[PDB]
Design a protein around this ligand. Structure first.
Ligand SMILES: COc1cc(Cc2cnc(N)nc2N)cc(OC)c1OC
Ligand SMILES: COc1cc(Cc2cnc(N)nc2N)cc(OC)c1OC
Lengths: 157, 156
């Protein structure tokens, strides 16, 4: 089972996924929409609830809180280990789509990073982890917008 | 100036960018939208007429047919060579976005390939070129849809 990771960060590494983040870049969220189309997303509870169950996405929500769903496209798992073991029987591909601690728990295990860097250095309390040494960038593209952004794909060797 | 190339093809290499393609995959066009946002696209006359001006794109149309657009985000050039030399002064990135003849002329000169392969074998006269051997795939992802499709990025 291939594991991807997708995140939007400021230049300083503040996580910019969230709903009412005021330094969002018009056009960047198109990348997230394109890459996650009919994909399994591994997310924590806060990420699921902020995002909602978007069309054409399937959700593995990891929480040991008493979270509940009646959406057949939303599975709940007490741990990452339990999520991964169970998705191995369901799909070939899972995209880790956030939570600070979700990303910190998993970044060493994933094969591919999809990183959007917004060209701003704002104040935040939740940072993306340092990219490990055994990842290398294999594609980069710049976008002019209200705030400029860069899209970069990394691969583990 | 980096040159990228973006296309949607069948599994037998038939070009499937067009407006009324029966074998178009739900979702795949999201990739084109995301990669082309506030980019310069290099296209032929036909591709530009079919596509019209989607907003938040700028267009370099190459044609020898003295084509006329009354449109803010379009520049007309007589050749590919003439287009690239003027764009070099205006932008650091152009995305070659179609005409089979456009793709044929430029594929050997571009740096990055964006290929969506739709899982089907229709008939058609306009094929995409064979991929020069100096290109390697650096990224693959598969999509289940009404017709399955694969997105692949190649680097020179
Ligand atoms: C599409 O809406 C959301 C998406 C995400 C996750 C996310 C968003 N953008 C990027 N580039 N990567 C991600 N993993 C997170 C969200 O809230 C925390 C969202 O709600 C606005
Ligand atoms: C978004 O609309 C169009 C886009 C294109 C070009 C194009 C379309 N899809 C992909 N994957 N790559 C491309 N270069 C070509 C078109 O018609 C010829 C379009 O009109 C529907």
């Amino acid at each position: 089972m291939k594991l991807s990771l997708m995140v939007a960060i400021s230049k300083n590494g503040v996580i910019g996924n969230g709903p009412d983040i005021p330094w969002s870049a018009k056009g960047e969220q198109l990348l997230f929409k394109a890459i996650t189309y009919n994909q399994w997303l591994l997310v924590g509870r806060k990420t699921f609830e902020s995002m909602g169950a978007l069309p054409n996405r399937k959700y593995a929500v990891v929480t040991r809180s008493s979270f509940t769903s009646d959406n057949e496209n939303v599975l709940i798992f007490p741990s990452i280990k339990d999520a991964l073991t169970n998705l191995k029987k369901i799909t070939d591909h899972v995209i880790v789509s956030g939570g600070g601690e979700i990303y910190k728990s998993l970044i060493d295990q994933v094969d591919t990073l999809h990183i959007s860097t917004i060209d701003i250095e704002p104040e935040g309390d939740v940072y993306f982890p340092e990219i490990p040494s055994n990842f290398r960038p294999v594609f980069t593209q710049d976008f002019a917008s209200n705030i400029n952004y860069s899209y970069q794909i990394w691969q583990k060797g």
